[PDB]
Paper text:
We used de novo protein design to generate very closely related proteins that adopt two very different states—a short state and a long state, like a viral fusion protein—and then created a single molecule that can be found in both forms. Inspired by class I viral fusion proteins, such as influenza hemagglutinin, we chose homotrimeric helical bundles as the fundamental architecture. We decided on a design scheme with two divergent conformations containing a constant six-helix bundle “base” and a variable portion with three inner helices and three “flipping” helices. In the compact “short” state (∼66 Å height), the flipping helices fold back to interact with the inner helices; in the extended “long” state (∼100 Å height), they extend to form interactions with each other.
Designs were given three-letter names corresponding to the layers in order, starting at the hinge proximal position. We sought to design calcium- or nickel-binding sites in the long state by introducing aspartic acid or histidine at the key hinge residue position. We also designed for structural ambiguity in the turn—with the result that the secondary structure prediction for residue 75 is mixed helical and coil, but with low confidence. Crystal structures were determined for all potential bistable candidates (XAX_GGDQ, XXA_GVDQ, XAA_GGHN, and XAA_GVDQ), and we chose to focus on XAA_GVDQ because of the presence of a bound calcium.
Author numbering:
A (entry chain C): 3 to 76, 78 to 93
B (entry chain B): 3 to 73, 75 to 93
C (entry chain A): 3 to 93
Write the structure that this text describes.
């Protein structure tokens, strides 16, 4: 979600600059509230990346199965082992 | 920029200690500005990750094409679909 | 640490709510500390992702090797191990 993030950060430097110009307890708190919103979109993006990473790994296994189908070097064992490791990591 | 991040975070843990030692409106504001810098570093790292996830998907497609050339088609259809879906997410 | 994030963020939205109900210099500093802790978790999760992205590139590399073993088109395999080399550098 790069687009949403960059707008979330652009909003931050502004809220920051506004805070820096006229510091206030309320201005500080509003600045913190904005930061928690930015981290919420960072987390949502990170969570999305992992979902895509798992989708990639699911695709690789289908490729290795397709390579084993047409007589790939039983090399295929080590690679599918990588996938098992990757699947566990995620 | 994993290394750059690690340095960015530890700079933050320091300011947090400095802040907590002598809390001050100016020290709090400095701590907030540093967090934005960290968030900007995190956002820049994420954008880099998504650019790489796209490069992989491009490679998976290229790999599948090569697989289809040397002969099966149903699996090849299933794989290419997952690839298109992944390009959709990005 | 996808799950830990989800939990580290909820703690933050709460400390934020408490801070908004009662604002105070101590409550502010405690909120900043939680954010550093949250950023520390976000960083640990990113570093994990990149380690995984490196693991994928070594698998694709191993696949393209297997494609060549059984006679994949050298031209295609050339551009494919190329994008593989570029990826390794980007990491």
């Amino acid at each position: 979600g790069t687009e949403d993030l960059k707008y979330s950060l652009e909003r931050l430097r502004e809220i920051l600059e506004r805070l820096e110009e006229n510091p206030s307890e309320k201005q500080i708190v509003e600045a913190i509230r904005a930061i928690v919103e930015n981290n919420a979109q960072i987390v949502e993006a990170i969570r999305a990346i992992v979902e895509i990473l798992a989708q990639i790994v699911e695709n690789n296994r289908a490729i290795i199965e397709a390579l084993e189908a047409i007589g790939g070097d039983q090399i295929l064992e080590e690679m599918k082992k990588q996938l098992k490791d990757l699947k566990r990591a995620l």
